[PDB]
Motif scaffolding. Structure first.
Motif, PDB file in Angstrom:
ATOM      1  N   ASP A 150      12.767   7.075 -20.569  1.00  0.00           N
ATOM      2  CA  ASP A 150      13.502   5.919 -21.320  1.00  0.00           C
ATOM      3  C   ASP A 150      15.119   6.381 -21.292  1.00  0.00           C
ATOM      4  O   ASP A 150      15.598   7.515 -21.204  1.00  0.00           O
ATOM      5  CB  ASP A 150      13.059   5.965 -22.815  1.00  0.00           C
ATOM      6  N   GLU A 169      11.178  37.607 -24.099  1.00  0.00           N
ATOM      7  CA  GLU A 169      10.448  38.409 -24.592  1.00  0.00           C
ATOM      8  C   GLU A 169       9.059  38.393 -24.188  1.00  0.00           C
ATOM      9  O   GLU A 169       8.272  39.397 -24.270  1.00  0.00           O
ATOM     10  CB  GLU A 169      10.236  38.298 -26.135  1.00  0.00           C
ATOM     11  N   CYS A 204      28.959  24.769 -22.342  1.00  0.00           N
ATOM     12  CA  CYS A 204      29.127  25.593 -23.483  1.00  0.00           C
ATOM     13  C   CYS A 204      30.422  26.479 -23.573  1.00  0.00           C
ATOM     14  O   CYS A 204      30.630  27.219 -24.248  1.00  0.00           O
ATOM     15  CB  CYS A 204      27.875  26.719 -23.611  1.00  0.00           C
ATOM     16  N   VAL A 253      -1.748  -6.318   4.327  1.00  0.00           N
ATOM     17  CA  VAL A 253      -1.721  -5.368   3.545  1.00  0.00           C
ATOM     18  C   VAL A 253      -2.788  -5.802   2.154  1.00  0.00           C
ATOM     19  O   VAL A 253      -3.626  -5.006   1.820  1.00  0.00           O
ATOM     20  CB  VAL A 253      -0.378  -5.099   2.745  1.00  0.00           C
ATOM     21  N   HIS A 299      18.236  15.189 -18.474  1.00  0.00           N
ATOM     22  CA  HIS A 299      17.232  15.726 -17.437  1.00  0.00           C
ATOM     23  C   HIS A 299      17.173  14.957 -16.316  1.00  0.00           C
ATOM     24  O   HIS A 299      16.085  15.216 -15.617  1.00  0.00           O
ATOM     25  CB  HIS A 299      15.751  15.766 -18.368  1.00  0.00           C
ATOM     26  N   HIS A 318       0.721  -1.403  -0.054  1.00  0.00           N
ATOM     27  CA  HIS A 318       0.286  -0.057  -0.035  1.00  0.00           C
ATOM     28  C   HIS A 318       0.922   1.323  -0.021  1.00  0.00           C
ATOM     29  O   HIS A 318       0.311   2.413  -0.062  1.00  0.00           O
ATOM     30  CB  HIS A 318      -0.775  -0.099   1.243  1.00  0.00           C
ATOM     31  N   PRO A 348      19.259  30.657 -21.132  1.00  0.00           N
ATOM     32  CA  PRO A 348      18.076  30.378 -21.866  1.00  0.00           C
ATOM     33  C   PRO A 348      17.985  30.644 -23.215  1.00  0.00           C
ATOM     34  O   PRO A 348      17.106  30.153 -23.945  1.00  0.00           O
ATOM     35  CB  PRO A 348      17.042  31.411 -21.011  1.00  0.00           C
ATOM     36  N   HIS A 349      18.756  31.299 -23.924  1.00  0.00           N
ATOM     37  CA  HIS A 349      19.056  31.871 -25.455  1.00  0.00           C
ATOM     38  C   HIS A 349      19.901  30.666 -26.267  1.00  0.00           C
ATOM     39  O   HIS A 349      20.292  31.308 -26.962  1.00  0.00           O
ATOM     40  CB  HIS A 349      19.015  33.085 -25.559  1.00  0.00           C
ATOM     41  N   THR A 350      20.143  29.521 -25.401  1.00  0.00           N
ATOM     42  CA  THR A 350      21.277  28.746 -25.964  1.00  0.00           C
ATOM     43  C   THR A 350      20.684  27.370 -25.957  1.00  0.00           C
ATOM     44  O   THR A 350      20.362  26.998 -24.888  1.00  0.00           O
ATOM     45  CB  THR A 350      22.660  28.923 -25.238  1.00  0.00           C
ATOM     46  N   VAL A 351      20.891  26.520 -26.848  1.00  0.00           N
ATOM     47  CA  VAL A 351      20.453  25.144 -27.201  1.00  0.00           C
ATOM     48  C   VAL A 351      21.626  24.426 -26.136  1.00  0.00           C
ATOM     49  O   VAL A 351      22.659  24.482 -26.089  1.00  0.00           O
ATOM     50  CB  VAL A 351      20.683  24.559 -28.553  1.00  0.00           C
ATOM     51  N   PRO A 352      21.160  23.737 -25.042  1.00  0.00           N
ATOM     52  CA  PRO A 352      21.604  22.886 -24.350  1.00  0.00           C
ATOM     53  C   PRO A 352      22.613  21.719 -25.113  1.00  0.00           C
ATOM     54  O   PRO A 352      21.768  21.089 -25.978  1.00  0.00           O
ATOM     55  CB  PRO A 352      20.623  22.285 -23.403  1.00  0.00           C
ATOM     56  N   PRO A 353      23.564  21.480 -24.882  1.00  0.00           N
ATOM     57  CA  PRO A 353      24.307  20.325 -25.546  1.00  0.00           C
ATOM     58  C   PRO A 353      24.321  19.183 -24.963  1.00  0.00           C
ATOM     59  O   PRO A 353      23.900  18.992 -23.686  1.00  0.00           O
ATOM     60  CB  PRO A 353      26.044  20.996 -25.799  1.00  0.00           C
ATOM     61  N   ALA A 354      24.402  18.029 -25.763  1.00  0.00           N
ATOM     62  CA  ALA A 354      24.345  16.731 -25.228  1.00  0.00           C
ATOM     63  C   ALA A 354      25.764  16.342 -24.578  1.00  0.00           C
ATOM     64  O   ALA A 354      26.699  16.938 -24.810  1.00  0.00           O
ATOM     65  CB  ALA A 354      24.089  15.636 -26.192  1.00  0.00           C
ATOM     66  N   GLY A 399      15.460  38.373 -20.018  1.00  0.00           N
ATOM     67  CA  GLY A 399      16.080  38.037 -21.530  1.00  0.00           C
ATOM     68  C   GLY A 399      14.833  37.570 -22.346  1.00  0.00           C
ATOM     69  O   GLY A 399      14.912  37.547 -23.575  1.00  0.00           O
TER      70      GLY A 399
END
Ligand SMILES: [Zn+2]
Lengths: 212, 43, 140, 685, 171, 171
Positions: D620, D253, D546, D48, D675, D19, D582-588, D251
């Protein structure tokens, strides 16, 4: 969510247990069946007739209050288990013929006492979601009455949380009332399995016998 | 079989990507560019 | 000239005493000579919501003593061991989870239910009982 | 915990669950029974779940020699991680009374014909054999009956700390010895230039505010000792300080009312209706360099070394005061200004850190028209919620708690506080459809400070809100008050057993949780009962994704774990993709090692266990474990390597450390997930 | 529309790291983005649809060009500023440095008839990578330029009669 | 879409016989039809919007051209086969025979800068009467042709960079 039943007070968990108690009726809707409100009364189907009746799945399983112990089926792939003894799904038509031909199945359940309809309860053991097919399927809850055609209620999608799906009967009071007699449930996907249909009425008054 | 089945690139069991992507998009997967190697895992 | 607006009401919601009607509009040329309200002249729904033959069932045990089969002859029907219960109802209002047994009651010279203790259905033996063998059941 | 069964006669394997999620550090007496009709599962003596689908014996007696019994795993390597203490298998089904009798007698049991196996691990090889390719598990010493009184009290469904428990807050209500007069030290941070001529708040404002603060608390046995601290820095003084203005939306809009000023460029031109003083909307360093014009006039670059707007957290980082011995009060001008800045709750990780305190408005501090809005900010800093928290601050009507009835565990968690909606006018508000479960409220606490009423209609606290005030000054704020009186035992002693001559009784530890004398300048505030040091991460570092040699410093992955929903993605955790702009693509992250987080502990100790609160995992993964590798650092430089572990969303990862003869001052968590959200760490010595 | 934020940079990154660099799967993932950089998937599909008309040198060039383009697209999409001019700059730069290092002009000199009749009007007017390929192939060879401008003229007569009727002769 | 039956001919006929032939009312009625003959109303409005830049000869030419076009559109719309190619043919023929008979070249040689700088690249491509006016106007004078090709090159530098980079020089 516990209860102790001894003088040295051994205790047990009562939500997943298969026995309904006096106190469990208002709290656990999943073990003591559908909770009828205090101002209404539920009536379940009798002499229920189906379309794709077979030896594997007969049509007398809809009669009476269904067992609420059957859990929801999450992305059910096969129905080769003993589910037809406590539910009903079409067995003559399999998965690929239903998926390609796009046929239709219906459950034309009758009732016994002719009363007005306040809500229609449909209790299903599954939502009909396939393991591969992620597309939602929407069923239709029709309604039939004596010496007249129908009074349509619309369509509804399946939710596991609301296994006893409730359909509010939409009705205008300017139109005169009708005595509901039978409920027809139609669906085109083969994975929809119906455990039992019902009909909610008023235990206080009947508006048909007075408005003759 | 003369050119060693293109290094096994036409058979799913011998490609690191576990997929078959023939050079012409017009070749059918069960025709000219099919895995016809009996030494693969298809048989 | 009179416009009739059907009042939609869901029957799960309890009724209410309507007292006032508000009619609102933005065009200045609407002229209204009178507004009405339709009710039921008969009832107020707020104050309201404030001999049967002998029955024989095969493969069962009719341990009931309804000597007079009048309107209200309560009998109990229970199947034997190895037999499951099938119910085909005829006339009923409410249901109760009796369990392996059932209660059949007399109403207007007929029984309210049609019970049938069908035998249990074992599966046809394909696998999972004997490994690498042929099954030929001569009876069923 | 689950118990699955499938007999030879049956056709369907059926499982029985528990439970609740299992406790990763508690001894559980698991009991599985099967008689022939119903199978039952007992977790710690309570039944239970029970299922009645399996019938008959589990196998034929002809195939008796073919069945095997495996412990700790299966043939497909479903290995187990944990301690097994007393194995027991019976040839008959025992009911609940026999289960509790075998629990209470432990393993000192005689020989019975029903008793098939009763194994206590003194000789494993007599009855058990390991895998011929594997190895036997190691035998250690442990005690299952270590405590006979549970010292842990669970907080309620919408509580946060120990004093939100029902039976602890009531002890501060009935009794009067816990509400003694207490002096709390606090400070006011006044910013000055390099000439000592212009304040942020005038001295008469502080003098009026101190007497008005002591006037409203002298009837509740609370006194405040004021120690005004003045910092002279013209770099901080001349620029705008903002509290509710987030730095990400500057930053972005998307407009927001918290960042709208002439010294912010009106959110960089992202809030004005029109979309140099007007050509500065985000001149590429022409208006920000000091050789051309002043920096504070027309510079709004978010990555500039010098800018006009400054967040309050960066001001606290620059100042770096002491919060363990004082309450810090800061000042910030904000465009919203309906309330003050966001106060720090006592259950936050920043309760005693230098980043914690009360942020106020300097143009309302000391004014006679807005004097009481500091007192409400006192009540947010002392563990008191808003009165409309159970009505207005309800995100969904299916909440675990919603204050429709006064209770000690719902809404405001005070019985005297009646439910009320969000109202600004004094007195009882009018009816509306905004409330999800009520329409008519009577005796609404408009006189309480926790409402949003004006200065005149707020006068006093309810007496059920002074128990929490006198509780949190003993629980979290013990170091603030200079009184040497220790924290009292907040619960009555419980009677365990008795006989004809004697009665044995035990009581709880004191409410602050300290098991030693409060000595400053030592580690005695982290030791536990039995000379056990439990510490969190003091310093954290991670490379910039980066940048080649960035090495930015994460902050949310240091202290104690504070997440309201342990599986929904939150902001109080460390992420590899949260380190980017926040204005930059996160890299792998790279392949053979992945991105890593380097946590450092304050006191280097020989470790015994390491617990990591991995909050959010992606749905996944490529490898079986989300955390790819864990490397324990050392003072000698020997990086002890540990392989991947399978983490769960809710249950924190716990690792037992064997044969670590070197002191470990920090860990490194190598992961490949983009993530993954690590919240905290704990090194149990 | 200047930010790629409207399309989650997480789902397209997951699609990029899930697919392989051999086929058109990376360009299949890349086409659904906030900025209008559609056209790389069309180039990958049309180059791998009419591969039979090319010789061994042309087929090897096509394989190496799509391999380098997929590898560079998965490589340099890691850290980049989220704005449409920067996306156009990096896409055009990777396309230019990929086509220049694999001898696009040699494939223009070998089999020009397939490579100048494959362009389609209304599929290159609104697509920037098609324009980049067209001008690079135009600068590769003079007779390739003449043939591709003959195809441009036939397509102008097919679709838009403005620039055929206006300045047919320049000076 | 090949027939003018989708929009009733009765309502547009009533609109034509109700309005006057002096203003752009006839072109206001005719612009909403099944076949895409949209653009005559724009010519009628823009010619009466920049009429102050012309001289007396140019304004007299504008009045005579709009009067002849309105009278022709009210005149020869009586018996005509209802299909879009026939409607396009009769519209182009009436526009051509109206502009040729009123000395369009004289008004071009009077003031060509207004007549080549007030044109718009947007909606020129999709409007057939605009293309008819452009391809009839450039046959008057070589300097007018040079000016309108200069305007087309300026609009290429403004809007569409494809044909500027591709075949800027003809041979
Ligand atoms: Zn507040």
């Amino acid at each position: 969510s516990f209860n102790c039943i001894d003088e040295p007070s051994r205790c047990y968990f009562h939500d997943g247990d298969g026995v309904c108690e006096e106190f469990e009726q208002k709290t656990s809707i999943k073990d003591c069946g559908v909770y009828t409100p205090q101002g209404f009364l539920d009536q379940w189907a009798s002499n229920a007739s189906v379309s794709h009746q077979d030896q594997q799945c007969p049509g007398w399983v809809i009669i009476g209050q269904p067992a609420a112990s059957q859990v929801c089926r999450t992305k059910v792939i096969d129905l080769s288990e003993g589910i037809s003894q406590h539910a009903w799904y079409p067995c003559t038509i399999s998965y690929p013929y239903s998926q390609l031909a796009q046929t239709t199945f219906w459950l034309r359940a009758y009732f016994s006492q002719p009363m007005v309809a306040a809500a229609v309860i449909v209790h299903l053991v599954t939502d009909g979601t396939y393991y591969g097919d992620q597309k939602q399927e929407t069923i239709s809850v029709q309604l039939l009455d004596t010496k007249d055609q129908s009074h349509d209620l619309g369509l509804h999608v399946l939710s596991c949380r609301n296994n006893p799906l409730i359909i509010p009967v939409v009705h205008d009071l300017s139109q005169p009332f009708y005595h509901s007699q039978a409920v027809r449930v139609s669906f085109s996907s083969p994975l929809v399995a119906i455990s039992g249909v019902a009909l909610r009425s008023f235990d206080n008054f009947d508006p048909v016998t007075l408005s003759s | 079989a003369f050119c060693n089945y293109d290094g096994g690139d036409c058979c799913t069991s011998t490609v690191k990507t576990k997929k078959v992507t023939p050079f012409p998009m017009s070749c059918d997967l069960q025709g000219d560019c099919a895995c016809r190697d009996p030494q693969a895992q298809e048989h | 000239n009179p416009l009739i607006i059907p009042v939609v009401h869901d029957l799960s919601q309890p009724f209410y005493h309507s007292q006032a009607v508000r009619v609102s509009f933005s065009s200045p040329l609407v002229a209204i000579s009178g507004v009405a309200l339709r009710s039921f002249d008969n009832f107020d729904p707020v104050t309201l919501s404030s001999d049967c033959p002998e029955l024989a069932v095969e493969n069962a045990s009719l341990n009931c003593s309804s000597s007079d089969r009048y309107h209200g002859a309560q009998c109990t029907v229970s199947c034997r061991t190895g037999y499951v219960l099938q119910i085909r109802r005829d006339d009923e209002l409410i249901k109760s989870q009796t369990g392996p047994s059932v209660t059949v009651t007399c109403t207007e010279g007929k029984w309210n239910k049609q019970v049938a203790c069908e035998p249990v259905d074992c599966s046809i033996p394909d696998h999972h009982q004997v490994y690498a063998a042929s099954f030929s059941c001569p009876e069923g | 915990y689950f118990f699955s069964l499938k007999t030879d006669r049956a056709r369907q394997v059926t499982t029985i669950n528990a439970h609740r999620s299992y406790l990763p550090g508690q001894w559980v007496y698991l009991a599985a029974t099967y008689d022939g009709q119903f199978m039952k599962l007992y977790v710690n003596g309570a039944q239970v779940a029970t299922s009645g689908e399996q019938v008959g014996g589990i196998f034929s007696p002809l195939t008796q020699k073919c069945k095997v019994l495996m412990l700790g795993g299966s043939a497909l390597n479903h290995n187990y991680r944990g301690y097994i203490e007393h194995f027991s298998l019976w040839k008959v089904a025992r009911t609940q009374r026999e289960i509790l009798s075998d629990m209470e007698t432990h393993g000192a049991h005689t020989a019975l014909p029903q008793l098939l196996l009763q194994e206590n691990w003194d000789n494993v090889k007599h009855a058990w054999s390991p895998m011929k390719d594997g190895s036997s598990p190691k035998v250690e010493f442990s005690n299952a009956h270590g405590f006979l009184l549970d010292t842990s009290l669970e907080p309620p469904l919408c509580g946060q700390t120990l004093c939100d428990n029902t039976e602890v807050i009531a002890s501060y209500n009935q009794l009067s010895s816990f509400r003694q007069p207490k002096v709390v030290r606090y400070r006011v941070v006044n910013l000055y230039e390099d000439d000592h001529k212009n304040p942020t708040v005038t001295r008469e404002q502080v003098d009026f505010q101190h007497h008005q603060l002591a006037e409203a608390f002298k009837q509740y046995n609370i006194s405040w000792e004021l120690d005004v601290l003045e910092v002279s820095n013209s770099s901080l003084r001349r620029r705008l300080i903002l509290a509710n203005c987030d730095i990400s939306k500057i930053g972005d809009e998307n407009c927001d009312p918290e960042c709208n000023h002439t010294l912010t460029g009106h959110d960089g031109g992202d809030c004005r209706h029109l979309r140099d003083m007007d050509c500065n909307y985000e001149d590429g360093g022409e208006c920000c360099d000091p050789e051309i014009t002043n920096v504070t006039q027309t510079c709004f670059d978010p990555d500039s070394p010098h800018r006009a707007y400054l967040d309050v957290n960066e001001l606290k980082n620059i100042l770096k005061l002491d919060g363990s011995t004082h309450l810090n009060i800061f000042f910030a001008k904000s465009s919203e200004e309906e309330l003050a800045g966001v106060a720090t709750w006592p259950w936050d990780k920043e309760a005693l850190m230098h980043l914690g305190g009360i942020v106020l408005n300097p143009s309302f501090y000391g004014m006679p028209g807005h004097t009481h809005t500091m007192i409400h900010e006192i009540g947010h800093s002392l563990g008191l919620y808003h009165v409309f928290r159970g009505i207005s601050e309800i995100q969904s009507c299916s909440d675990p708690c919603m204050e429709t009835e006064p209770s000690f565990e719902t809404g405001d968690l005070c019985n005297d506080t009646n439910p009320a909606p969000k109202h600004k006018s004094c007195g009882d508000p009018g009816p509306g459809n905004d409330t999800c479960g009520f329409h008519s409220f009577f005796n609404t606490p408009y006189n309480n400070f926790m409402s949003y009423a004006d200065d005149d209609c707020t006068d006093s606290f309810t007496p059920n809100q002074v128990a929490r005030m006198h509780c949190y000054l003993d629980l979290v704020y013990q170091g603030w008050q200079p009184s040497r009186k220790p924290a009292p035992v907040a619960l009555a002693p419980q009677v365990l057993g008795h006989t004809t001559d004697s009665v044995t009784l035990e009581w709880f530890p004191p409410i602050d949780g300290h098991f030693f004398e409060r000595e400053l300048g030592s580690a005695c505030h982290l030791c536990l009962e039995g000379r056990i040091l439990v510490q969190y991460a003091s310093n954290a570092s991670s490379p910039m994704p980066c940048s080649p040699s960035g090495h930015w410093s994460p902050r949310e992955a240091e202290g104690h774990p504070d997440v309201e929903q342990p599986c929904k993605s939150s902001v109080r955790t460390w992420s590899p993709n949260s380190a980017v702009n926040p204005h930059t693509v996160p890299p792998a992250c790279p392949e053979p090692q992945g991105c890593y987080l380097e946590l450092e502990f304050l006191y280097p100790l020989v470790p015994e266990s390491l617990t990591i609160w991995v909050t959010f995992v992606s749905t996944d993964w490529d490898s079986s474990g989300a955390v790819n590798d864990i490397k324990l650092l050392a003072v000698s430089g020997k990086n002890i390597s540990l392989g991947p572990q399978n983490v769960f969303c809710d249950v924190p990862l716990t690792i037992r450390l064997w044969d670590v003869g070197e002191e470990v001052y920090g860990i490194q968590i190598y992961t490949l997930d983009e993530h993954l959200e690590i919240d905290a760490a704990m090194l149990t010595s | 529309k200047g930010r790629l934020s409207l399309q989650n940079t997480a789902e397209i990154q997951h699609c990029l790291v899930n697919a392989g660099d051999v086929g058109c799967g990376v360009f299949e993932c890349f086409e659904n983005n906030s900025c209008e950089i559609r056209g790389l998937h069309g180039i990958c599909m049309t180059f791998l649809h009419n591969a039979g008309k090319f010789d061994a040198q042309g087929k090897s060039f096509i394989k190496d060009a799509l391999k380098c383009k997929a590898h560079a697209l998965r490589h340099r999409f890691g850290c980049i500023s989220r704005k449409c001019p920067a996306i156009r700059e990096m896409v055009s730069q990777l396309q230019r440095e990929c086509y220049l290092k694999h001898d696009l002009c040699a494939a223009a000199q070998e089999n020009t008839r397939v490579i100048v009749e494959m362009i389609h009007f209304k599929d290159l007017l609104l697509h920037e990578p098609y324009v980049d390929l067209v001008n690079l192939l135009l600068t590769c060879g003079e007779e390739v330029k003449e043939a591709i401008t003959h195809s441009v003229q036939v397509q102008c007569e097919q679709n838009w009669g403005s620039l055929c009727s206006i300045l047919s002769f320049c000076t």
